[PDB]
Design a protein around this ligand. Structure first.
Ligand SMILES: [Cl-]
Ligand SMILES: [Cl-]
Ligand SMILES: [Cl-]
Ligand SMILES: [Cl-]
Lengths: 202, 196
């Protein structure tokens, strides 16, 4: 009736802690993020460690993991350009988003691999993809290295300031977004995802 | 067929509406914290997610009120500790009662429970909760003299998980029945799962 387990993160592995965090903190919204390399290549990848930071000005966060203490393409590109695009992930293109999640060699475009379509941004110099129903042009407010060791951070928490919103007209009503028309997708544990659940009001 | 909207033109409330209606669904942290005088506070926050697994780090972005910290962030900074509870269908009604602006816990009829590592109590009603130490409180947005929020980075020092939810390290999502926030006063239950 209330059997509770105590679990000490110091007494289990990183993978064990990962499984507990990703299974407990659910559902998670998924940012599909595009960024550009110094060589001009358009990268894209999904990140479920995504949320709002503030509305004044509009600030969002995406935590991008490092590989053995080194920044991933998305973080490197965001810091180098100071710009990136955050797209809302939805049922209409989640198949293509999933295709991007695989590991290409650096400086290969997951966007082109996944048959997605670049669309130039208005304020920033990093394109997004046309397939998204909502996307946000961002400038990088700060990148915060976190976790891991003094010398080898586990991740970089990217704080992005939205400088342009692009919203499908059919989703927009009096400043609000039709959640059931959007059909956002979310991430659970493992390779499980979730569609938007039944709504309720309090 | 796409609208282009400059956030600098529209109002803070207009931007608030677009963010909260677009970045969905959001998991809801019910967070307890203690004042200098030992009063237990609790409030829900949907600007919540994982930061990293090594060590286990989480984030909660707590909005200010006219440039002043809310109780949760003031309390977290003073104590260096706080408890994050997963919000779920079995006690969302009580969680909602604590959003009101004394102890929110008593009001909402929730049940304090002492923590193992930290000195901030949690509530028994949660099926999953995480004792956290404060790593960072980062003021963001707003003006330099009036920030918009404090982004709290917590390190998990103890997990507490209902046994019926726990299967050799994994959590049964269907058993948990987590709740999520959408725009306005709208929430969502966990949706239909699929594999990728
Ligand atoms: Cl390219
Ligand atoms: Cl990552
Ligand atoms: Cl808040
Ligand atoms: Cl305690």
């Amino acid at each position: 009736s209330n059997a509770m387990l105590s679990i000490n993160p110091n007494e289990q592995t990183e993978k064990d802690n990962y499984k507990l965090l990703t299974g407990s903190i659910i559902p998670r919204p998924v940012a599909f993020v595009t960024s550009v390399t110094k060589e001009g290549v358009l990268n894209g990848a999904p990140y479920s460690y995504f949320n709002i930071v503030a509305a004044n000005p509009p600030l969002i966060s995406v935590s991008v993991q490092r590989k053995a203490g080194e920044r991933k393409d998305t973080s490197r590109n965001a810091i180098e350009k100071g710009e990136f695009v955050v797209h809302i992930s939805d049922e209409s293109y989640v198949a293509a988003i999933n295709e991007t999640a695989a590991n290409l060699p650096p400086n290969e475009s997951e966007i082109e691999l996944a048959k997605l379509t670049p669309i130039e941004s208005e304020v920033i110099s990093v394109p997004g993809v046309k397939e998204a129903n909502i996307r946000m042009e961002c400038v990088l407010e700060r990148a915060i290295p976190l976790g891991g060791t003094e010398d080898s951070p586990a991740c970089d928490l990217l704080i992005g300031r939205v400088v342009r919103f692009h919203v499908a007209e059919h989703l927009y009503e009096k400043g609000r977004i039709h959640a059931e028309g959007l059909k956002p997708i979310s991430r659970l544990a493992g390779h499980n995802y979730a569609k938007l659940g039944e709504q309720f009001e309090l």
